[PDB]
Design a protein around this nucleic acid. Sequence first.
RNA 1: GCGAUGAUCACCCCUUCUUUUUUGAAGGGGUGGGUACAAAUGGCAGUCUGACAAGU
Lengths: 11, 37, 68, 177, 125, 238, 357
Amino acid sequence: EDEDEEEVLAM
Amino acid sequence: RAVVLGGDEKKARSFIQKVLTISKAKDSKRKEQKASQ
Amino acid sequence: EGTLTDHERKYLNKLIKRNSQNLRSWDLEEEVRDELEDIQQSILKDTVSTANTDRSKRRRFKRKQFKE
Amino acid sequence: FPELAKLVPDNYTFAKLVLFIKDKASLNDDSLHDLAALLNEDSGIAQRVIDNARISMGQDISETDMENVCVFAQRVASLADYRRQLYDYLCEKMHTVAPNLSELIGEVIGARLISHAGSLTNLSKQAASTVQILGAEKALFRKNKGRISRYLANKCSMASRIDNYSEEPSNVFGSVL
Amino acid sequence: TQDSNYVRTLRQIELKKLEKGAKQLMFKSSGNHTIFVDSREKMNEFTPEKFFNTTSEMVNRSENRLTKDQLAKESLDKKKLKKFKQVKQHLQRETQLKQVQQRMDAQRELLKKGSKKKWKKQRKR
Amino acid sequence: GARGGAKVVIEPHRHAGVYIARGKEDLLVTKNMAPGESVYGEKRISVEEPPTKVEYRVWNPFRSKLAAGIMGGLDELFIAPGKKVLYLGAASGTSVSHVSDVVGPEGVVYAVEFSHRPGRELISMAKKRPNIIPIIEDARHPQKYRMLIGMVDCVFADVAQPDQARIIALNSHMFLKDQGGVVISIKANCIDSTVDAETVFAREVQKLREERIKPLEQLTLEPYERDHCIVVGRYMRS
Amino acid sequence: AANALEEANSIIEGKVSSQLEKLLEEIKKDKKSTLIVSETKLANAINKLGLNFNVVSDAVTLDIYRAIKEYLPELLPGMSDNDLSKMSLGLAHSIGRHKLKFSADKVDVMIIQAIALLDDLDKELNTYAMRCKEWYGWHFPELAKIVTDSVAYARIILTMGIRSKASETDLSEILPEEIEERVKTAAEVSMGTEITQTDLDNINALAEQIVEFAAYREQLSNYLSARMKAIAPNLTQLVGELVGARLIAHSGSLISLAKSPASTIQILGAEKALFRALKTKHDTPKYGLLYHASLVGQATGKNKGKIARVLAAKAAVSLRYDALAEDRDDSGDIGLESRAKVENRLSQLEGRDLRTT
RNA sequence: GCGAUGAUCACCCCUUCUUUUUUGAAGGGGUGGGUACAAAUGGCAGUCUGACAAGU
């Protein structure tokens, strides 16, 4: 599922 | 799907991607050696 | 008793320099406080707001005054 | 009566004193002697509690609440008495089952070592080195210090075998050991 | 791709996180100070060194202006620049999360059943 | 910032009973009279001393108006260890408990408050502190609680009432010692919002002067709080 | 202190107390004496007593009082300053409690400890029951499978100590007819080994703790029941005793729960599903801790969710009545009327038939 | 007056003067880690949505 996930607003 | 993750999740989420890449390269190379034989 | 001699008034004065010199390290540099102060104001102005309180003071004064 | 909680730090003493001093309002000279008989006045608490009970700020609790406290406090009294009775039972049983082991080290420590092993038979079967490591968590047997521990460990292994495989073990070998 | 519930919770993380982050931070005082004295001769002879009993360096530092009698790292401060901006980044995120919730909010009222001539006036029964 | 595992250096403030925690960040800090518990969820610092473990409490300028004064750099504070203190307007233990640490075990704090609901919070906090004597009374009528209060070395009033000066006036005559201390927190909005802040502060100073109170300094609380000033005064009965 | 509080209140009310009164007639012998009183109100009241005193209460007299109370510890021999502070400290709280209308029967901190105590006892009692089961099970391992209840099990050891007693010992009062004969049959074909009287004495002592504690656990339950009916009555009639205490304990205080919206009350106890659901876009819980209320139990199917929303709303109404009331009657009337409304709500939802007839 | 009933085997706190002269003189504590227990109003950690629904 981590592939399906996408990360944003990174810090 | 867009999500925001904490530092602990992020430092981990790199690693499973790391391990999976190593396994794929390990698997692919073994396939090639047997294929050459 | 205020019986300090000239020699004694120098030893303590040296201690003023010694302790004051020590506290300077924890006082941090002048270059850092520049951006710290700049960052410091930004975070106040959003949490403290003051767009309405300042505005509200003017409105009361204007309404308060006679209009001719 | 919060101030009393400080005065007699021996915790078992509170349950008895609270059982007597149910209400801090009740303060009599005869009561002072009674609570003075409880424990000793050398600490001076007997005068302090009468004074403190007079000058205190704890909010008065309902009679039902106090009934819970003394009954609940009475419960703590029973377990401690039963625990003391059970402790003596362990001592007597431990002497009967493994007199050598008990005499060498002690009843409570010996009883622990059996529990670590899981059974007296298990302890006897086990080699000398591991028996030292069996009690290495609670410091049961505890550079010169380590030597005594190891030396005592073998002798503790020595005693266990005698007790396990003897129908009626005696304490003669444990003593010389 | 994200719903009203997911965005709402996130902003609630950062508002509380921002609240804690600001609390640990100190903040130099900017209030104004006045001293009341007796006489005009006492005015002209006044100086901060005498009244506070401090040296010139410590007069500037109002937070901890130790009496003179009492007196008798780039990486470290760089990490301080990290700490202050760290709170700033949360502040930026919180308003950013606020905007999406507002946009997510608005679409739901548009989807809401109504007259919508701008809403025409119709006492919902 | 001052996370749980952070290590800090603690050294005393210029004022007795007030301390600062060096390290990375500087925090104004006071000893804890009741170690092991936080009245209002603040952060606590603990230090090993020969070894007994002494605890310390973080102290927020934004919550206590007196705390913002310390950051402001108040010259003189009559609040100090071993002094009786009369705190008017003790809404809760957010500040009184921290006054209680400064005075220490020898000193005492007399907390005065009107509203019943904040009083419940004040009384509960007083249970953890023996040096705090709470007084659920109206500050406008000090005669009601003359029974419970002795002389006080310093009078602190954060009451946000238009007639706070009169409230300060009555208690100071009854309770404050000659050559004693008085520290007032002033909110212009509650007294007179129409006129600018400075006139209200100038107005209040005149009221204290009429009451044989000599002002020593005045200090606003920006950026911690807006349109406020702490007036430090002395009571000269003569 | 009770006397001291009464005298203190009389001062505050400006009324002359008996202790004040009697202490004055002792001085009535002195003809034409001036009395200085700190307050005019007390000064006026004392004038009405008819005593032969010229009572004066003036601003100048404050100077006299100021010096007196400054040097009071020295003025009063035999009483130290520390004692005087302790005198004042205790009296203030009693005065503060009195003005606050504090009552020993309306303190919510009692409940949160009682429910916490009840849980601790339950965990406590399982463990010793297990100890009894496998310690005594050595002597008779078959009882655990037959009788499962710990308290009933323990009483078996008390009535019969050794399996030989099973032949003559009667277990009717502990166990029904069909079960009691099973243990009798097992006794003769049992597996455990004989135990000494010394062993029997101590296992009996353990059993005595099992049976006694269960009694106290029952008393604590009844004790907990009374408090809520006095502290938060209207909640008890609506949601019940066991659930209501948990709600108060979950928030940590009655006022904290009173300030929470009804939606939070509905899901107060399933947050883990809630915050897991919210962050993963899955359906959120709809019962929380309120699932164990009687009314929710009566409902069925989707109606449980509907009743949960309605009951949570009415639970807040009853709760907020209990918490913020200055002069609440300990009757629970608002709880009763709200209960009827939910029951009326339940009846019509339950009356509704999804299937078309 | 030994022993197989068992010996042996983490960190830190040359200079000056001088000489019948190749001669003489002087200069325990703190850190770290492991085991079990108790407390924290310390952290993860943020309390679902909100006007329609049921009948002829």
